[PDB]
Symmetry: D2
């Protein structure tokens, strides 16, 4: 059984098990800021950021044809100084070693254009903040499942609680092939969930890097932070003590 | 760090680490039937069943004041032979060691009447399949958080996928004091979630037994299966 | 798969998940005094104490023939007022739900006489401070593995370090059938390890309780404490991740 | 809490989470050969191999000054065609990231001479098959704890069981500073163990890579394999 795991309960200015791409920084205070935030905490336009774990994960194996199970939770904050105008969102993702940032804004760092392409080999769960009709975005802000796509194969409503902290759990069960993303604001006591069957074995290579990508608006005023506070991950490729995972890590 | 954990990937005819109460039984196939189901797989009216883990869990500590965190998941099936006439529900609960089954039907074996009583010292997440006006049940089948009372302090719509297996995750963060219940049908790809602040240190004794309880209707014809296939649990209480 | 586990970093005056047998008691400061100790700290002779976890463990399965892996650690101190006359020992055991305390002294509450008996259905790792030649005890304080007999199937020297805390790790691999007992004294930086093949399936029942058992001497002045400060246990019975267990406990 | 962990119960011809240096090969059967071996399985002399996990581990933190606890387990086999001529052994180590292979032979790719140098920032537990009197090696094959020097600060006897697989548990306790290496041979039932107080935080950088280094003999015929079947690692550095 091939296993992979880490917990970051805070992040650090010196974090060599994390590869920063784009504008991503870790502040002195230990917030991973995925996207550009000026000195008075004001988010900034035309930004793009990704942060992925130093090490590859073996997500499926072609000798056995077996597909890994995984669990990730993380805690993040989106702050808008002006909630009427916000863009573009953040995503948790899986992609090949060594994927680089694609186009920004509503492509969220993971894709290059509206269309589907098997070469992306990216799946991500997006937390999508600005409606792009071009991508068949729903009118409400929404959690989204993207598989080589940016046009989510499934979405649901997600009401941003401005400047408030969100706890996420994302979960993938190899035998059901079920993907589930939970989102909770302990402050507002509101909650959101989504699930779909998605076949990791057709869309991802055997090895993958995982992490976060975020973009802000391409038109100033349309602005927000994408600050991540802590991040936990575990994958298992057999041939996932999950109650034990949530509670511990 | 007082920790307490178990996993049952299936249930066994012989098993001393579960206390069955009421009609609860384990089929030869390793299914935990909380509720009576005859020889052809037909739910029976007026049943009540509970199962809990043999050993008490230290849930909070009066001397330190600190309160445990926990998580539990389980996969369960509800079968109705007629989906238009169904009752009453199942629930995961925490209750004092000794807790015995109470009134059945809409009380789900956890309560005695509709009123709030601090003496229950019971917190439950109910999956409630039949509207009791008198408990202010919503006019849909729902997930509910019950704190010393069958009248939930919170609820959300739950749409029942009949006879399909449901996967539950129930989560309690002691720093936040946040209870979260999630339910997914892998078969249907539907999904449901509810959250609320609940102060366990006020409502539960330091020690509890944890488990399931479930009941079927009193009017015959208001009947459903309440089967648990697997259950894992973990709790952590710090010093 | 069927698994069960628990951790006591301290013991509490009220502890319903521990059945206390004989003299076993939990002090106000949280020690599990297995054998009797007055208010000055003096260990008292003719004592028998056993403590075990409230809930039964499924350690093997007939319909399947699979055997549990397991792993347990604990921290215990033995204090002796006169280093030179000490007795009789303490033991970690697996026995039936629900075993009761057998004979005290050199039998350590787990056995009645010197002979092996099928019906005991008791496997114990023993920390043995007094030579009973009747039992084929060696001339030195020792660790030994007891399979239905107090005549240990195997032993190794164990130099007791008076009133110092000993850390134990006991490990069972059902694949290899290998049982391993290890003991360390962080203070004195000393260490001792024993291993052997034992077959649990053909010795234990499908269901056991596990815990500790201790005796002091029959001859007075032949005394010592048996204090347990901390304990954790984890078992796995297939239809452990040993490393991450020894880091959580 | 910063936490880091991985399990390889198999090695794979494509293994991107492992950086392999010198002669290190993963074979088609999923064995990590630290040291060079022909198609017939005969080890070769003048070989040096290391393998470490791709991603750095934070073992201590200066701002708080706390040190990681960690635990690692692995199975390895050493086979010698002539047990009377064997060299030089293997080691699990922590060193700086970007650390590279040193002098081979009985330096075990880990040091360059017989001399304590605070700059190595290298802690190793070695399983040493050849007596280097130059390094203060005892007259028996041994397990040794190497803190910044191949001249072990403490060792103990270890009886090599030719071509048989060994199980190792190496543990570290940040609060006791206690370092423990256990080795067991399932087939033989032999057992060995060593422990000592080590101060990681004066010796190691805040960040390290961890893995295995091995070496065969710098003389004709002083040869043995150094094969690794499986490896897991867990580290926890408190906040
Ligand atoms: Ca969008
Ligand atoms: Ca109801
Ligand atoms: Ca004796
Ligand atoms: Ca040497
Ligand atoms: Mn979208
Ligand atoms: Mn209700
Ligand atoms: Mn003995
Ligand atoms: Mn040496």
């Amino acid at each position: 059984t091939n296993t992979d795991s880490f917990t970051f309960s805070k992040f650090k200015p010196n974090q060599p098990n994390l590869k920063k791409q784009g504008d991503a920084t870790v502040t002195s205070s230990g917030t991973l800021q995925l996207t550009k935030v000026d000195k008075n905490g004001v988010p900034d336009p035309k930004s793009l950021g990704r942060a992925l774990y130093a090490s590859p994960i073996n997500i499926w194996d072609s000798k056995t044809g077996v597909v890994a199970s995984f669990a990730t939770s993380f805690r993040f904050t989106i702050y808008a100084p002006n909630i009427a105008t916000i863009a573009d969102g953040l995503a948790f993702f899986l992609a090949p070693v060594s994927s680089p940032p694609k186009a920004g804004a509503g492509f969220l760092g993971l894709f290059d254009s509206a269309v589907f392409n098997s070469s992306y080999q990216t799946v991500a769960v997006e937390f999508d903040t600005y409606e792009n009709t071009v991508f068949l975005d729903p009118p409400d802000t929404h959690i989204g499942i993207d598989v080589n796509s940016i046009k989510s194969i499934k979405t649901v409503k997600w009401d941003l609680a401005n400047g408030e902290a969100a706890k996420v759990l994302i979960t993938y069960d190899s035998s059901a092939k079920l993907l589930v993303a939970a989102l909770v604001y302990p402050s507002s006591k509101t909650s959101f969930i989504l699930s779909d069957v998605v076949d990791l074995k057709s869309v991802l290579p055997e090895w993958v890097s995982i992490g976060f990508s975020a973009a802000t608006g391409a038109s100033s005023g349309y602005i927000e932070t994408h600050d991540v506070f802590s991040w936990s991950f575990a994958s298992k490729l057999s041939f996932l003590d999950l109650a034990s995972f949530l509670v511990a890590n």
